[PDB]
Design an enzyme around this catalytic site. Structure first.
Site, PDB file in Angstrom:
ATOM      1  N   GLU A 237       1.015  -1.082   0.142  1.00  0.00           N
ATOM      2  CA  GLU A 237      -0.038   0.073   0.121  1.00  0.00           C
ATOM      3  C   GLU A 237       0.949   1.111  -0.006  1.00  0.00           C
ATOM      4  OE1 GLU A 237      -3.065  -0.519   0.114  1.00  0.00           O
ATOM      5  OE2 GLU A 237      -2.871  -2.714   0.313  1.00  0.00           O
TER       6      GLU A 237
ATOM      7  N   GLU B 277      -3.867   5.021  -1.607  1.00  0.00           N
ATOM      8  CA  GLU B 277      -2.812   4.442  -1.005  1.00  0.00           C
ATOM      9  C   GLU B 277      -2.416   4.847   0.355  1.00  0.00           C
ATOM     10  OE1 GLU B 277      -3.119   1.927  -2.441  1.00  0.00           O
ATOM     11  OE2 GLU B 277      -3.184   1.988  -4.511  1.00  0.00           O
TER      12      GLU B 277
ATOM     13  N   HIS C  66      -4.901   3.237   2.714  1.00  0.00           N
ATOM     14  CA  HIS C  66      -4.751   1.709   2.932  1.00  0.00           C
ATOM     15  C   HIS C  66      -3.493   1.521   3.912  1.00  0.00           C
ATOM     16  CE1 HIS C  66      -7.618   1.194  -0.952  1.00  0.00           C
ATOM     17  NE2 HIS C  66      -7.984   1.803   0.093  1.00  0.00           N
TER      18      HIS C  66
ATOM     19  N   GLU D 186      -2.794  -5.196  -8.415  1.00  0.00           N
ATOM     20  CA  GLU D 186      -4.174  -5.049  -7.918  1.00  0.00           C
ATOM     21  C   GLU D 186      -5.129  -5.852  -8.567  1.00  0.00           C
ATOM     22  OE1 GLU D 186      -3.456  -0.874  -8.793  1.00  0.00           O
ATOM     23  OE2 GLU D 186      -3.479  -0.313  -6.812  1.00  0.00           O
TER      24      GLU D 186
ATOM     25  N   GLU E 115     -10.211   0.318  -4.509  1.00  0.00           N
ATOM     26  CA  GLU E 115      -9.383  -0.868  -5.347  1.00  0.00           C
ATOM     27  C   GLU E 115      -9.933  -0.645  -6.924  1.00  0.00           C
ATOM     28  OE1 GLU E 115      -6.753  -3.020  -3.367  1.00  0.00           O
ATOM     29  OE2 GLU E 115      -5.860  -1.655  -4.782  1.00  0.00           O
TER      30      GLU E 115
ATOM     31  N   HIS F 279      -8.493   1.555  -9.179  1.00  0.00           N
ATOM     32  CA  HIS F 279      -7.105   1.404  -9.305  1.00  0.00           C
ATOM     33  C   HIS F 279      -6.967   0.429 -10.535  1.00  0.00           C
ATOM     34  CE1 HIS F 279      -6.415   2.387  -5.101  1.00  0.00           C
ATOM     35  NE2 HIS F 279      -7.105   3.272  -5.519  1.00  0.00           N
TER      36      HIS F 279
HETATM   37 FE   LIG Z   1      -4.228   0.047  -1.725  1.00  0.00          FE
HETATM   38 FE   LIG Z   2      -4.723  -0.213  -4.790  1.00  0.00          FE
END
Ligand SMILES: [Fe+3]
Ligand SMILES: [Fe+3]
Lengths: 383, 167, 510, 383, 76
Positions: free
Chosen positions: C98, C128, C131, C193, C227, C230
């Protein structure tokens, strides 16, 4: 030893629970009549909480109360107001505010205001405000005004105890807290200033004296005391205070006076505060409008009836506020004449705006005839 | 041999005794330049101070850098390499060689040495970065072209490894 | 005009692309074989105020649950001890992936030329940070309420001691920030991811809730929500470079390199942490892996990109081979070298075994036998003075670290598909374990110089190494890590010391 | 079948759990060196997350990285900046902001702004703003400025990838988002205006053209492009952008120009927006100050060393911004000359304030000699 | 004077008592055998903004638990 996580107990409860649901209706108070398309949570958690009986329009209970006042005044009764209606629950605040949404929002304002203040002082932005505006006007007459807000806040105590429905109750209470907030915030700006400009007396002594003895706030103090202590008809207090008095004089004093002239005397601090009072106003407005225009002034059975009292109260209280304003326009005498704001014409359009909006916002909705021109002339006489 | 504690052992101690003695910026530049030819990159001279070189280097970087702020005039710190070379010249130079490289094996060496010779504090930060960046794009392009072409056996020989065992 | 009106986020997002302006020097600073299109468009019309608003709301519900409800339930000490210990490594290792993403995605926002495209990355950049702090919160909370806070309370320092830490660094630290932005992109977004994190964060809540863990599901269910944006960032990466002639040459090369990097560590480690760091099994990894990698990803996700001249990695078939036994191969190495960790392990019990043999016929005769053999030898008893690593050495089973991936290798007991190649170069020996990394190293010798634990610890007695690296608990004598998860007979430095374990240079015989 | 609530499993886990704790240290990362009295959560969740090795000042790991760039550039390395220090982790944001606190606050601002906007339009407060200010100045030059903010926001991408510590990283990222927010918010005011005053073109076409071709924003565009694309030393980008360029020109443009003159041309809308940009500035300031003044300029071993580069960068970039300002003071030519604000003296005190604060806020802290008088004269030449 | 300063709730609460003002008709509307003193003091110095802030925080944790955690547990 909790039943959810204790092996032997969870096991025991597990056995007692049935394999299927014992009813499929899962909408909490599904029988509430939706205003919008489908039932809201604001409705579901508010509607019918007040135990009214069938002898009070809208209620679903039965029988007399179980304890009245000495002599027999009902816990809640139809003697509290002259206004009648098909259902007292009909009211819906457009903001669908229940307790949570309401404090959540204010909580944002609370924290943001303290961030803003800590930066503003580090910003030294105070350096360029007009000293006269700061010291003479702001410190005194703006301080004085907190008393107008505080008065209006107080005219809600009996309302809070006497209204006949839950929604109106909440609309009534959030209204009151917003007014004591205004009062509290005007002082907060006053205290912040003191911390920044040495010798600035942020106490209430002078603004207090001005309210009670200065002719500029004479009519206002008159109206306020009468709305607050003068009556007990909860709808009359609500209407006169918000729909007439504040909609006019209050709105003129805040938006047209303090906020507007703040952006001409180079004051970057006051509009921060007025942003809150002006937003708060608009929120109460939607609630007030629903209750009086939608619910009352337009009740299928008692519209014309309630409008009789509405137009009555309107003529009485508007006259009071015209006077309030007439006293207020004496303040202009103490400011620098900016060509087009603090001069006769400048001030005249300020009035034009006020009376003009009120006419479309409230007047026309209730059938009250008002010749905006005459009222501006009226106020202007005390200029 | 027998290893000593990660962050405190006789080796870093001794090199620090050494670094401490440097006093001229000229002095410090040769030292760090010699240090990186001898100990960094897979084309290093020695692998003896393998687990201590990076810490030692950083300590030398510190000595050099401090020396420059107190001896070279401010302008030079921006406009030139500690070698007395004009930073842009150095950039012009190396970006020219890499572009002249005819193989990946030829490209890599140019990039690897440019660093050994010019890693800050020898070359200004802003200058080194873009040059390093520019050299890097070339190497990558020369390299990622027909990446799976040569078999392992072939690659082993082009690299010139001494294959001590295959399972 | 007095009518209540505001401005909606999509209204603002409508002008973002015009925010950028031309100038001769408006180009990326990083070395790269690609050029992202200038009018590339973003997929989610989010903006600053809206970003904050959207996330905070999530935050509120999450923190209400852990801080309020779960504490009241005494939940932090209702997890099974195995899983409680596994969460030390799972949460901290992830925290790094992360973490590095904040930087990787920043390099990407630097790469992009379209305002909108930088926007998507920048969004990822904030995600990020969130996380990293969420992964830290799991261990933080566990420090407060779990029966064993050691390990949870300091992995950001105690992870530096053992080998598994280095692999995680390659995939989730270095693989996201060092190299062509695009390689870093495929490594993070398209494979990391899209192939791993996303399904992983959901699979973890399953393995957690199953073993009494309700901390993790609370946090991760929140994480996975961000996510999706991402996965979209990777998608946009290909799209922005789809008309770049370079892509035709380079793209697929990077994609296969990125994919092998990820599978290398993830294939064996997650299966290992699931199957061994659990008491209650949720589903066997070999089956999980084929749905994630073989199907959902190679199958569906990748195909959607085929229209960009993007193909299934050529190493996919090689990956598939490994998925069955690679994690069990790792298990041996992990249990064996247990004193270098920051977590308390547990040998597969009489029933864990039964599940193992049932889901991987053949496991028993090979792995089962060795695990039981060790149990008899005194694996968990501090009075035995026995360490599986020494038994490995005494019986000819050497452990090598792959100079590229860092993943350990015991060829004599390995059932996975790899093999040793030891080369000498410029006076240094190197152990490689598969065709793909051997090529990577052969071509990019200077991108791969990472020292290993043997190189660093050579000739040192294991306890000295542990004490120096702080593998001890509050009393400064007892080891965080343990070979058992019971509450008595905890091993100490003296205990370790009596085994006389000294690190050999495994490459000295070649 | 969850282990917490399933009888047979909860029972099984219950048996496996030990009766006592296996260690008493419950402080998460207790070994972090507190800045304040005791360890904060902001510290505990941020400090040491970055896996730096001992060869990078402060880090606790060991060995080389496991994958570098082609040619060998480290994942993170000492080549990224000219500034050296005893520990890169030393940095602490005074706001102790981690991700949660940060979005929580902005989330408040987000929602409050939309409430305020819905009220303001219902308030018709737009009616009294100066049309010239609105149409000519605000719409064009205020719009143009978003590009200054957007530029600064972008000069953070490489910083985000290249800084050597977690705290600096977060300080760096929250800084960037605040700048793109400013840009986004300036446009939001522009779009709100369009919805209210018919014919008002809220698009960016004109403000865009002005930025890139109008001489008023010439020096600014110069500085911005150079900070953004000109360099890669992450500390130099941070210093020049926040501590010099924004602290001066940006601060002058926002506070001294747009916000100040808004409270003189009767504009009650703009100060609402500038309140945010000005608060945001002050927040980044504390972070920037800690990193450069506390951590760097005063590092026991490299203070004088880092100050050499700081004073270097300062002399270079300040000169750039003096010019930026000199170009900017050309805008005054397009406003009504309010006696004491838009006139030579009025504008001169604006400068006085700017350069004067910067001198105590940044200059004196780093040993940079600046004769405030000379710099005001300098800017004023382009008046 | 540029130093970060705000106003604390107790600072505001300091002027509340002066907010009321005298006038012959300032009396309760309800029937009652008592008369509450005029300078009586309150025990908690809370104010509007502070009230909202204090409660919302409670609200957040409560609603996170029921809506989020307990639903996930099938607790109802
Ligand atoms: Fe993440
Ligand atoms: Fe991510």
């Amino acid at each position: 030893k909790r039943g959810l996580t204790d092996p032997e107990r969870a096991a025991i409860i597990a056995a007692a629970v049935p394999d299927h649901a014992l009813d499929t209706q899962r909408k909490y108070h599904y029988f509430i009549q939706p205003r919008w398309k489908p039932l809201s949570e604001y409705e579901q958690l508010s509607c019918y909480a007040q135990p009214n009986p069938d002898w009070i329009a809208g209620g679903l209970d039965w029988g007399d109360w179980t304890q009245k006042f000495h002599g027999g005044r009902p816990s809640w009764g139809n003697e509290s107001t002259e206004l009648r209606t098909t259902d007292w629950y009909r009211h819906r605040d457009p903001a669908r505010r229940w307790h949570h949404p309401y404090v959540k929002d204010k909580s944002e304002e609370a924290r943001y205001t303290q961030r803003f203040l800590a930066a503003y002082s580090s910003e030294g932005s105070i350096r360029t405000i007009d000293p006269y505006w700061r010291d003479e006007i702001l410190n005194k007459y703006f301080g004085a005004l907190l008393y107008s807000e505080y008065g209006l806040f107080n005219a809600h105590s009996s309302v809070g105890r006497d209204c006949l429905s839950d929604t109106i109750r909440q609309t009534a209470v959030f209204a009151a807290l917003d007014k004591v907030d205004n009062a509290q915030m005007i002082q907060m700006e006053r205290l912040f200033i003191a911390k920044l400009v040495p010798g600035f007396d942020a106490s209430t002594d002078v603004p207090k004296k001005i309210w009670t003895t200065d002719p500029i706030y004479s009519g206002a103090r008159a109206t306020v005391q009468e709305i607050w202590q003068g009556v007990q008809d909860w709808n009359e207090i609500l209407w006169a205070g918000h729909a007439v008095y504040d909609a006019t004089f209050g709105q003129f004093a805040r938006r047209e006076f303090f906020q507007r002239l703040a952006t001409v005397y180079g004051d970057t601090l006051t509009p921060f505060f007025t942003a809150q009072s002006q937003t708060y106003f608009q929120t109460t407005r939607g609630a007030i409008d629903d209750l009086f225009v939608y619910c009352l002034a337009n009740d299928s059975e008692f519209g014309a009836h309630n409008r009789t009292f509405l137009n009555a109260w309107t003529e009485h209280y508007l006259a009071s506020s015209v006077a309030a304003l007439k006293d207020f326009v004496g303040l202009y005498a103490k400011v620098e004449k900016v060509a087009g704001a603090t001069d006769s014409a400048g001030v005249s359009e300020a009035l034009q705006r006020v009376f003009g909006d009120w006419k479309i916002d409230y007047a026309d909705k209730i059938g009250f005839r008002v010749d905006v021109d005459q009222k501006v002339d009226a106020v202007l006489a005390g200029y | 041999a027998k290893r000593e504690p990660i962050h405190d052992n006789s080796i870093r101690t001794e090199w620090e005794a050494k670094i401490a003695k440097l006093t001229s910026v000229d002095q410090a530049t040769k030292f760090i330049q010699d240090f990186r030819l001898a100990y960094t990159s897979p084309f290093r001279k020695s692998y003896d101070i393998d687990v201590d070189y990076q810490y030692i280097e950083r300590k030398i970087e510190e000595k050099l850098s401090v020396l420059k702020t107190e001896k070279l005039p401010v302008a030079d710190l921006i406009t030139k390499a500690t070698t007395g070379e004009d930073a842009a010249a150095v950039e012009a130079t190396w970006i020219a060689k890499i572009k002249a490289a005819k193989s990946k094996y030829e490209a890599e060496a140019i990039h690897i040495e440019f660093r050994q010779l010019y890693k800050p504090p020898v070359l200004p930060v802003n200058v080194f970065l873009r040059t390093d960046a520019a050299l890097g794009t070339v190497l990558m392009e020369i390299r990622n072209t027909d990446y799976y072409g040569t078999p392992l056996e072939g690659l082993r020989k082009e690299r010139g490894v001494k294959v001590l065992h295959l399972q | 005009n007095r009518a209540p009106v505001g401005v909606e986020p999509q209204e603002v997002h409508k002008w973002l692309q015009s925010f950028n302006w031309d100038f001769k020097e408006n180009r990326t600073k990083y070395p790269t074989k690609y050029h992202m299109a200038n009018e590339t468009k973003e997929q989610f019309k989010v903006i600053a105020k809206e970003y904050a608003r959207m996330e905070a709301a999530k935050d509120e519900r999450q923190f209400g649950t852990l801080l309020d409800g779960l504490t009241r339930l005494g939940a932090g000490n209702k997890v099974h001890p195995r899983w409680g210990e596994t969460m030390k490594v799972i949460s901290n290792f992830l925290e790094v992936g992360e973490y590095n993403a904040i930087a990787a995605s920043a390099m990407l926002w630097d790469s992009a030329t379209a305002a909108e495209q930088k926007n998507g990355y920048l969004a990822q950049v904030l995600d990020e940070i969130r996380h990293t702090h969420q992964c830290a919160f799991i261990n933080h909370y566990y420090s407060k309420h779990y029966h064993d806070p050691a390990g949870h309370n300091d992995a950001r320092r105690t992870r530096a001691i053992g080998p598994l830490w280095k692999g995680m660094k390659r995939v989730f630290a270095d693989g996201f920030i060092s190299g062509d932005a695009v390689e870093c992109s495929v490594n993070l977004q398209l494979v990391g991811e899209a192939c791993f994190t996303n399904p992983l964060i959901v699979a973890v809540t399953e393995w957690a809730s199953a073993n009494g863990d309700e901390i993790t599901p609370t946090v991760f269910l929140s994480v996975e929500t961000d996510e999706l944006r991402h996965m979209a960032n990777g998608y946009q990466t290909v799209v922005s470079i789809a008309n770049d002639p370079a892509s035709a040459k380079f793209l697929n090369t990077d994609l296969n390199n990125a994919f092998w990097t990820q599978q290398k560590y993830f294939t064996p480690v997650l299966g290992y942490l699931f199957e061994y760091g659990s008491k209650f099994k949720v589903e066997p990894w070999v089956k999980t892996w084929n749905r994630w990698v073989s199907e959902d990803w190679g199958g569906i996700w990748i195909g959607r990109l085929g229209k960009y001249g993007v193909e299934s990695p050529r190493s996919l078939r090689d990956a598939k081979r490994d998925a069955y036994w690679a994690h069990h191969d790792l298990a041996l190495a992990a249990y064996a070298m247990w004193p270098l960790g920051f977590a308390r392990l547990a040998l597969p019990d009489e029933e864990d075994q039964a599940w193992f043999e049932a889901n991987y016929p053949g496991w028993a005769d090979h792995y089962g036998k060795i695990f039981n053999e060790w149990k008899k030898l005194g694996y968990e008893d501090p009075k035995s003075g026995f360490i599986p690593y020494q038994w490995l050495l005494a019986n000819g089973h050497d452990v090598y670290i792959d100079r590229v991936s860092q993943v350990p290798f015991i060829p004599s007991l390995a059932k996975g598909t790899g093999s040793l190649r030891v080369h000498e170069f410029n006076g240094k020996k190197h152990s490689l374990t598969d065709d793909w990394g051997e090529r990577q190293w052969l071509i990019e010798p200077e991108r791969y110089e990472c020292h290993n634990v043997f190189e660093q610890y050579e000739g040192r007695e294991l306890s000295e190494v542990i004490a120096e690296g702080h593998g001890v608990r509050s009393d400064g004598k007892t080891l965080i890590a343990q070979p058992h998860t019971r509450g008595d007979n905890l091993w100490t430095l003296e205990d370790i010391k009596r085994a006389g374990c000294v690190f050999p240079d495994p490459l000295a015989k070649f």
